[PDB]
């Protein structure tokens, strides 16, 4: 659902990684802030010459178009069966 | 006649003109690297 | 007009000593710099001139140690990291600032960087 | 590209010493020139051969014709010596010149 109601600002909160080495596996998660390379000489560190930042911000503005509005995106994930039951669909065990 | 100009212009070119008023015949290639067709090539990858 | 450099290093055979060259007294994006090797008993010979704006660089085929010169724009710095290495790259390396057409002029280099490559 | 200067030219004060770059096969109007004393920044001394850069002193002048590129220093100071470097423009990347030892007399 939009957050262009309540999160737009432009919003720089939110925000995104616009480059990694290579593509994600399921649920994995990336908190190294290093920064990138993209040529073949050591950045020290430093934006430039193939040298930049990876995480960039989407700026949410409420003037922006839905292109460029912010959705709060929620999943509610489960292992179908099986498994031990713990959230449940509101049936009472019978006897 | 008036404001009608003539696009292409030859510069007189002199060789009295200076090293950056000279001349200089000038190619550019284009090629695409990896990605494309070898037909210039060199061995390529051609191992023995 | 004045360029800070990398520190003095000995780099292995076949390593990379990455020397930095870093724009101070002048605008790094509107000069070629060039790069000029000076071994010890040695005199200038040329390895390659850095484009500020364009990161493709004429690279020297002489001595050839697949000199790629990076042109960082975000901290001013002309990179020649030097592969390749080897006892003669040992040096002092002047990146030399100059203008960016066939016109080649240089007077203030780095202030020279001096890295033996020696194992 | 390939240009060649004199190993070194050892000459006395107040004697004029006009140091050689001779370039091999092609050449251009434009060519450059320097002193460096030893181990140090060089510091270019003439400026398409035709024009010295400025801040360099009177004594250090430049020219050329066809191969021939001269850079001509004037009246030795027992203080100037150093290693007169000169690059060859265009044609190709460039040998610097092998520098002249200024050995001074006197």
């Known amino acids: 659902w939009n957050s262009n109601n309540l999160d737009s600002k432009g919003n720089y909160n939110y925000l995104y990684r616009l480059f990694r080495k290579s593509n994600l596996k399921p649920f994995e998660r990336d908190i190294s802030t290093e920064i990138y390379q993209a040529g073949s000489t050591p950045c020290n560190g430093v934006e430039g010459f193939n040298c930049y930042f990876p995480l960039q911000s989407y700026g949410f503005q409420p003037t922006n178009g839905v292109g460029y509005q912010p959705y709060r995106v929620v999943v509610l994930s489960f292992e179908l069966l099986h498994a031990p039951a713990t959230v449940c669909g509101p049936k009472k065990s019978t006897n | 006649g008036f404001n009608c100009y003539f696009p292409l212009q030859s510069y007189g070119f002199q060789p009295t003109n200076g090293v950056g008023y000279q001349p200089y015949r000038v190619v550019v290639l284009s090629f695409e690297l990896l990605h494309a067709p070898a037909t210039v090539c060199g061995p390529k990858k051609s191992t023995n | 007009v004045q360029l800070v450099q990398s520190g003095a290093e000995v780099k292995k055979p076949g390593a990379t000593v990455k020397i930095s060259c870093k724009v101070s007294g002048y605008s790094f994006s509107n000069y070629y710099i060039h790069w000029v090797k000076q071994a010890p008993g040695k005199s200038l010979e040329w390895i390659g001139y850095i484009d500020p704006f364009n990161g493709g660089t004429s690279d020297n085929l002489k001595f050839k140690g697949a000199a790629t010169l990076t042109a960082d724009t975000s901290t001013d710095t002309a990179y020649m990291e030097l592969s390749s290495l080897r006892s003669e790259d040992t040096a002092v390396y002047y990146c030399?600032?100059?203008?960016?057409?066939?016109?080649?002029?240089?007077?203030?280099w780095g202030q020279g960087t001096t890295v033996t490559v020696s194992s | 590209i390939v240009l060649t200067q004199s190993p070194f030219q050892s000459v006395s004060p107040k004697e004029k010493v006009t140091i050689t770059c001779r370039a091999s096969?092609?050449?251009?109007?434009?060519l450059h020139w320097y002193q460096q004393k030893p181990d140090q920044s060089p510091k270019l001394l003439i400026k398409?051969?035709?024009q010295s850069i400025s801040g360099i002193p009177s004594r250090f002048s430049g020219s050329g014709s066809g191969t021939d590129f001269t850079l001509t220093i004037n009246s030795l100071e027992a203080e100037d010596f150093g290693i007169y470097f000169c690059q060859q423009t265009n044609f190709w990347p460039y040998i610097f010149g092998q520098g002249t030892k200024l050995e001074i007399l006197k």
């Open positions: 398409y051969a035709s």
């Open positions: 030399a600032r100059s203008e960016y057409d066939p016109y080649y002029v240089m007077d203030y």
């Open positions: 096969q092609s050449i251009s109007s434009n």
